Amino acid sequence: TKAVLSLKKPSAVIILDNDDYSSTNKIQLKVEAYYEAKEGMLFDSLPVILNFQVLSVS
């Protein structure tokens, strides 16, 4: 597990190295969610968006 994101601390920095790059060409990362919904609120078709930015490569 590399990072935990939340509504109060939305940003995190992770590192991928030689051990992560299996098959020498790709990284696989699944997402795990924990939540509690507001009381008496009904809705549908609400998107959740994540963004990626590269800081350094070598």
Partner 1 sequence: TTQSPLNSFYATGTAQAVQEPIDVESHLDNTIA
42 touching partner 1, by CB under 8 A: yes
47 binds partner 1 (CB under 8 A): no
> Does 52 interact with partner 1 (rule: CB under 8 A)?
no
The answer to whether 16 touches 27, Cβ cutoff 8 Å, is yes
For position 48 contacting partner 1 by CB under 8 A, the verdict is no
* Residue 16 main-chain phi, psi, to 5 deg: -115, 130
Binds partner 1 by CB under 8 A, chosen from 34, 35, 43, 52: 43
Please check whether residue 13 is in contact with residue 55, taking contact to mean a CB–CB distance below 8 angstroms: yes
Residues at the contact surface with partner 1, assessed by CB under 8 A: 39-43
